């Protein structure tokens, strides 16, 4: 059913890497295509660390999370708890 949400960072959308990178390494756990973007117009497909570096400038912005696959919720929901920190 796809899942997508806009997580307002407090100053760390996991952008850093470890957590945002877990999506990917964890994606191997959740079958889902989690998409990370900033309402700013910055778009990052959970897997393009380069793209994640983009939202790094986040710090206050808001991210739009979108996952799609069997476990897109657990995945997007796992980041969220992370995006939500």
From Swiss-Prot:
InterPro entries: HPr, HPr-like, HPr-like_sf, PTS_HPr_His_P_site, PTS_HPr_Ser_P_site. One of its GO terms (cellular component) is cytoplasm. Keywords: Cytoplasm, Phosphotransferase system. The active site is at residue 16. Residues 2-85 form the HPr domain. Its main location: cytoplasm. Coiled coil: none annotated. SUPFAM superfamilies: HPr-like. GO terms for biological process: phosphoenolpyruvate-dependent sugar phosphotransferase system. It comes from the Bacteria. Belongs to the HPr family. Component of the phosphoenolpyruvate-dependent nitrogen-metabolic phosphotransferase system (nitrogen-metabolic PTS), that seems to be involved in regulating nitrogen metabolism. The phosphoryl group from phosphoenolpyruvate (PEP) is transferred to the phosphoryl carrier protein NPr by enzyme I-Ntr. Phospho-NPr then transfers it to EIIA-Ntr. Could function in the transcriptional regulation of sigma-54 dependent operons in conjunction with the NPr (PtsO) and EIIA-Ntr (PtsN) proteins. PANTHER family: PHOSPHOCARRIER PROTEIN HPR, PHOSPHOCARRIER PROTEIN NPR. This is Phosphocarrier protein NPr.
